[PDB]
Design a protein around this motif. Structure first.
Motif, PDB file in Angstrom:
ATOM      1  N   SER A   1      72.729  48.414  47.542  1.00 13.45           N
ATOM      2  CA  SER A   1      71.311  48.134  47.352  1.00 13.45           C
ATOM      3  C   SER A   1      71.162  46.866  46.492  1.00 13.45           C
ATOM      4  N   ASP A   2      70.373  45.907  46.984  1.00 19.80           N
ATOM      5  CA  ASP A   2      70.385  44.541  46.466  1.00 19.80           C
ATOM      6  C   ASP A   2      69.831  44.473  45.041  1.00 19.80           C
ATOM      7  N   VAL A   3      70.311  43.482  44.286  1.00 20.92           N
ATOM      8  CA  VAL A   3      69.892  43.317  42.902  1.00 20.92           C
ATOM      9  C   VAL A   3      68.440  42.858  42.864  1.00 20.92           C
ATOM     10  N   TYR A   4      67.692  43.353  41.879  1.00 22.56           N
ATOM     11  CA  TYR A   4      66.329  42.914  41.622  1.00 22.56           C
ATOM     12  C   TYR A   4      66.353  42.072  40.354  1.00 22.56           C
ATOM     13  N   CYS A   5      66.018  40.801  40.497  1.00 18.39           N
ATOM     14  CA  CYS A   5      66.106  39.854  39.398  1.00 18.39           C
ATOM     15  C   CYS A   5      65.085  38.757  39.693  1.00 18.39           C
ATOM     16  N   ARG A   6      63.943  38.813  39.004  1.00 17.85           N
ATOM     17  CA  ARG A   6      62.767  38.015  39.340  1.00 17.85           C
ATOM     18  C   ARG A   6      62.375  37.106  38.185  1.00 17.85           C
ATOM     19  N   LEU A   7      62.213  35.824  38.493  1.00 22.91           N
ATOM     20  CA  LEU A   7      61.482  34.870  37.678  1.00 22.91           C
ATOM     21  C   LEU A   7      60.163  34.564  38.372  1.00 22.91           C
ATOM     22  N   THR A   8      59.075  34.545  37.614  1.00 24.14           N
ATOM     23  CA  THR A   8      57.790  34.326  38.252  1.00 24.14           C
ATOM     24  C   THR A   8      56.753  33.909  37.215  1.00 24.14           C
ATOM     25  N   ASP A   9      55.841  33.040  37.643  1.00 22.35           N
ATOM     26  CA  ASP A   9      54.643  32.743  36.865  1.00 22.35           C
ATOM     27  C   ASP A   9      53.648  33.891  36.877  1.00 22.35           C
ATOM     28  N   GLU A  10      53.731  34.785  37.863  1.00 18.40           N
ATOM     29  CA  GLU A  10      52.754  35.850  38.004  1.00 18.40           C
ATOM     30  C   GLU A  10      52.974  36.924  36.944  1.00 18.40           C
ATOM     31  N   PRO A  11      51.948  37.719  36.648  1.00 22.35           N
ATOM     32  CA  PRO A  11      52.156  38.873  35.766  1.00 22.35           C
ATOM     33  C   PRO A  11      53.246  39.791  36.306  1.00 22.35           C
ATOM     34  N   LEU A  12      54.070  40.302  35.396  1.00 24.13           N
ATOM     35  CA  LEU A  12      55.183  41.154  35.777  1.00 24.13           C
ATOM     36  C   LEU A  12      54.689  42.519  36.237  1.00 24.13           C
ATOM     37  N   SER A  13      55.496  43.171  37.066  1.00 29.25           N
ATOM     38  CA  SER A  13      55.147  44.468  37.622  1.00 29.25           C
ATOM     39  C   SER A  13      56.172  45.489  37.158  1.00 29.25           C
ATOM     40  N   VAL A  14      55.765  46.346  36.225  1.00 21.85           N
ATOM     41  CA  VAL A  14      56.600  47.474  35.840  1.00 21.85           C
ATOM     42  C   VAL A  14      56.852  48.364  37.047  1.00 21.85           C
ATOM     43  N   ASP A  15      55.852  48.490  37.923  1.00 19.30           N
ATOM     44  CA  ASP A  15      56.015  49.306  39.122  1.00 19.30           C
ATOM     45  C   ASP A  15      57.127  48.765  40.029  1.00 19.30           C
ATOM     46  N   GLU A  16      57.208  47.439  40.217  1.00 19.44           N
ATOM     47  CA  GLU A  16      58.303  46.888  41.026  1.00 19.44           C
ATOM     48  C   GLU A  16      59.658  47.174  40.400  1.00 19.44           C
ATOM     49  N   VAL A  17      59.776  46.978  39.082  1.00 19.67           N
ATOM     50  CA  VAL A  17      61.048  47.207  38.406  1.00 19.67           C
ATOM     51  C   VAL A  17      61.483  48.662  38.555  1.00 19.67           C
ATOM     52  N   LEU A  18      60.561  49.605  38.347  1.00 17.92           N
ATOM     53  CA  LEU A  18      60.921  51.014  38.467  1.00 17.92           C
ATOM     54  C   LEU A  18      61.284  51.369  39.908  1.00 17.92           C
ATOM     55  N   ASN A  19      60.495  50.887  40.866  1.00 24.00           N
ATOM     56  CA  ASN A  19      60.792  51.118  42.272  1.00 24.00           C
ATOM     57  C   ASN A  19      62.167  50.576  42.647  1.00 24.00           C
ATOM     58  N   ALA A  20      62.570  49.443  42.061  1.00 25.14           N
ATOM     59  CA  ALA A  20      63.848  48.834  42.424  1.00 25.14           C
ATOM     60  C   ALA A  20      65.055  49.610  41.902  1.00 25.14           C
ATOM     61  N   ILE A  21      64.867  50.550  40.977  1.00 22.73           N
ATOM     62  CA  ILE A  21      65.980  51.324  40.436  1.00 22.73           C
ATOM     63  C   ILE A  21      65.875  52.797  40.782  1.00 22.73           C
ATOM     64  N   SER A  22      64.821  53.206  41.487  1.00 22.08           N
ATOM     65  CA  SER A  22      64.643  54.608  41.824  1.00 22.08           C
ATOM     66  C   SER A  22      65.581  55.009  42.958  1.00 22.08           C
ATOM     67  N   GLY A  23      65.718  56.320  43.129  1.00 25.14           N
ATOM     68  CA  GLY A  23      66.660  56.894  44.053  1.00 25.14           C
ATOM     69  C   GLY A  23      66.713  58.400  43.890  1.00 25.14           C
ATOM     70  N   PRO A  24      67.137  59.108  44.937  1.00 26.45           N
ATOM     71  CA  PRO A  24      67.213  60.577  44.837  1.00 26.45           C
ATOM     72  C   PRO A  24      68.308  61.056  43.893  1.00 26.45           C
ATOM     73  N   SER A  25      69.332  60.243  43.648  1.00 23.82           N
ATOM     74  CA  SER A  25      70.367  60.579  42.680  1.00 23.82           C
ATOM     75  C   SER A  25      70.029  60.173  41.236  1.00 23.82           C
ATOM     76  N   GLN A  26      69.010  59.337  41.008  1.00 24.25           N
ATOM     77  CA  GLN A  26      68.691  58.847  39.658  1.00 24.25           C
ATOM     78  C   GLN A  26      67.667  59.764  39.002  1.00 24.25           C
ATOM     79  N   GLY A  27      68.111  60.565  38.032  1.00 22.81           N
ATOM     80  CA  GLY A  27      67.224  61.475  37.323  1.00 22.81           C
ATOM     81  C   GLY A  27      66.515  60.921  36.093  1.00 22.81           C
ATOM     82  N   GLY A  28      67.062  59.865  35.491  1.00 24.14           N
ATOM     83  CA  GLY A  28      66.447  59.214  34.348  1.00 24.14           C
ATOM     84  C   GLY A  28      66.310  57.714  34.526  1.00 24.14           C
ATOM     85  N   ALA A  29      65.237  57.137  33.983  1.00 23.48           N
ATOM     86  CA  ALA A  29      65.005  55.704  34.025  1.00 23.48           C
ATOM     87  C   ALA A  29      64.344  55.262  32.724  1.00 23.48           C
ATOM     88  N   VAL A  30      64.758  54.105  32.220  1.00 25.88           N
ATOM     89  CA  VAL A  30      64.263  53.562  30.964  1.00 25.88           C
ATOM     90  C   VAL A  30      63.806  52.141  31.256  1.00 25.88           C
TER      91      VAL A  30
END
Length: 139
Positions: free
Chosen positions: A1-30
């Motif tokens: 699953s491809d790396v998520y690593c974003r530089l952007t002028d736009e406001p950051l998205s916590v939702d994108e970051v969390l979505n990029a690390i979610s998974g049925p095997s991942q029970g915790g996220a920080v």
């Protein structure tokens, strides 16, 4: 699953970051979110600029991401940093790390932001209302 690593002028998205690390095997996220404080060293901040050469910044973040992910099984790390002009309260950096269990997520998330502050070649230009300005090649 491809790396998520974003530089952007736009406001950051916590939702994108969390979505990029979610998974049925991942029970915790920080997720760590760094925001522009209204005071720096006893001065009232008015604005920040961030500058970066993207390929050279992405290279350094890959080192960190690889170092964080090899700390424990199933660890996934994703990073987003803003460029351009930020105002008070804006999210400058968002990092997330997920793991099967919460302990490894906390370990990786902490390591990721510490190395990012230590090592990543992103220029900061910070202005205070009383004329003072700070420049540094780290954030």
């Amino acid at each position: 699953s491809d790396v998520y690593c974003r530089l952007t002028d736009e406001p950051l998205s916590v939702d994108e970051v969390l979505n990029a690390i979610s998974g049925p095997s991942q029970g915790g996220a920080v997720i760590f979110v760094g925001t522009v404080r209204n005071n720096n060293n006893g001065h009232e901040v008015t604005k920040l600029y961030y500058e970066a050469y993207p390929a050279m910044v992405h290279r350094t973040l890959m080192d960190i991401i690889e170092e964080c992910e090899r700390q424990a099984d199933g660890v996934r790390v994703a990073v987003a940093h803003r460029t351009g002009e930020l105002r008070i309260g804006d999210a400058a950096v968002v990092i997330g790390a997920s793991a099967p269990h919460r302990a490894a997520a906390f370990d990786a998330a902490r390591m990721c932001i510490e190395r990012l502050k230590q090592d990543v070649p992103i220029w900061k230009k910070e202005f205070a209302l009383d004329g003072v300005e700070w420049v540094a090649n780290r954030p």
